[PDB]
């Protein structure tokens, strides 16, 4: 049971107004993956929680393209399968990505090995009729996938 | 119950290898925040879950810095409470940025307005290997964060 709710931007702004009114300098401390030392927690005037922070949805396709690149890059070829070689297609609604990643993602993709049979395809995101939006996004996703094996990530 | 476990990289590699041995092309579909159309779900051979993809730790300070910026921008236009103003420090263990986001986080920081009394202080992260007394690494990091904080009011986030 937590004595507080996740901050709004206006609620956070109101918290900042209280700090400005007070006027004393403020330090907000964030540790590594394992959190903070005892000494940090003991010295705090206020202990806040990052447990409601989530992955922004535009980064889902970024994390997934990285996962796929990392996994492909340790697969071993099959010098016995004259297959129609398998091609992998990431089809994602292209919700707008933060500034700090939007262009790094593009250069990150362009550094994928040429030998990697991967393409990323980004569907225009509908302008938010939720149901007709999803039908139209799905129409294009299915056009791209064609006769492929379809895996959804929901 | 979910009939699968979050992939790590060797497990996803084995999955990709199974697709290679099968040979048919594969499409992986990711909707927007509202998800996927019924036609898409009806057509899926498998339906996978993104519910375990978490915020990478290095982006925590990025999202906190962004929140503070967006919150600060809507505080009182510029009528400040005094000519001895509150300064805010974001003191954060600087774990290494993912490759796709690499430089970007520093240009975003540069684009902050000069009149926003916000400053990011990155504390060097301990080497987190197999050995690694994670208690010691935490004590040292914590020591450096406390030194940066000085006599400020200290707000922790964990």
Residue by residue, what is the 3-state secondary structure of A94-148? CCCCCHHHHHHHHHHHHCCCCCCCEEEEEECCCCCCHHHHHHHHHHHHHHHHCCC
A33-37: long-range contacts at Cβ-Cβ below 8 A with a sequence spacing of 24 or more? A33/B57, A33/B95, A33/B128, A34/B134, A34/B137, A34/B138, A35/B138, A35/B158, A36/B138, A36/B142, A36/B145, A36/B156, A36/B158, A37/B138, A37/B139, A37/B141, A37/B142, A37/B143
Which residues in B lie closer than 8 A to residue A152 (C-beta atoms)?
A: 28-29, 36, 40-41, 44, 46-48
Q: Is residue A59 domain-shared with residue A9, that is, in the same domain?
A: no
Number of structural domains chain B divides into: 2
Beta-carbon separation of B29 and A152 below 8 A: yes
Q: Is residue B67 domain-shared with residue B21, that is, in the same domain?
A: no
Beta-carbon separation of B41 and A154 below 8 A: yes
Q: Is residue B20 domain-shared with residue B69, that is, in the same domain?
A: no
Q: Is residue A103 domain-shared with residue A120, that is, in the same domain?
A: yes
Q: Is residue B86 domain-shared with residue B158, that is, in the same domain?
A: yes
Which residues in A lie closer than 8 A to residue B45 (C-beta atoms)?
A: 149-151
Determine the Cα–Cα distance for residues A113 and A149; give it in Å rounded to an integer: 23
Q: Is residue A46 domain-shared with residue A63, that is, in the same domain?
A: no
Whether A12 has a binding-site annotation, put simply, is no
Beta-carbon separation of A74 and B48 below 8 A: no
Count of residues making up chain B: 158
What is the experimental resolution, given in Å to one decimal place? 2.4
Q: Is residue B70 domain-shared with residue B100, that is, in the same domain?
A: yes
Q: Which of A27, A54, A81 marks a domain boundary?
A: A54
Domain extent for B19? 1-54
Q: Which of A33, A54, A75 marks a domain boundary?
A: A54
Return residues 13-32 of A near B (CB < 8 Å): 13, 15-17, 19-32
- CA-CA-CA-CA torsion sign (A38, B62, B90, A18): negative
Q: Is residue B38 domain-shared with residue B105, that is, in the same domain?
A: no
**Sequence-ordered list of residues with C-beta below 8 angstroms from that of A7, at least 6 positions apart, any chain:** A15, B67, B71
Q: Is residue B28 domain-shared with residue B67, that is, in the same domain?
A: no
C-alpha angle B96-B97-B99 in degrees, rounded to nearest 5: 120
Beta-carbon separation of A12 and B71 below 8 A: yes
């Amino acid at each position: 049971m937590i004595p507080g709710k996740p901050f709004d931007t206006p609620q956070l702004a109101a918290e900042l107004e209280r700090w400005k009114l007070d006027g004393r300098d403020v330090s907000l401390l964030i540790g590594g993956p394992e959190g903070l030392s005892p000494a940090c927690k003991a010295a705090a005037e206020q202990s806040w929680s990052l447990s409601a922070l989530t992955l922004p949805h535009p980064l889902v396709r970024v994390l997934v393209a990285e996962s796929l690149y990392r996994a492909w890059s340790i697969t071993t070829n099959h010098p016995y399968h004259r297959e129609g070689s398998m091609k992998l297609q990431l089809v994602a609604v292209g919700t707008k990505m933060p500034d700090w990643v939007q262009t790094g993602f593009t250069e990150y993709l362009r550094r994928f090995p040429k030998d990697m049979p991967f393409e990323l395809i980004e569907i225009p995101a509908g302008k938010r009729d939720i149901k007709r939006i999803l039908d139209k996004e799905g129409e294009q996703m299915l056009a791209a996938a064609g006769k492929n094996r379809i895996v959804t990530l929901d």
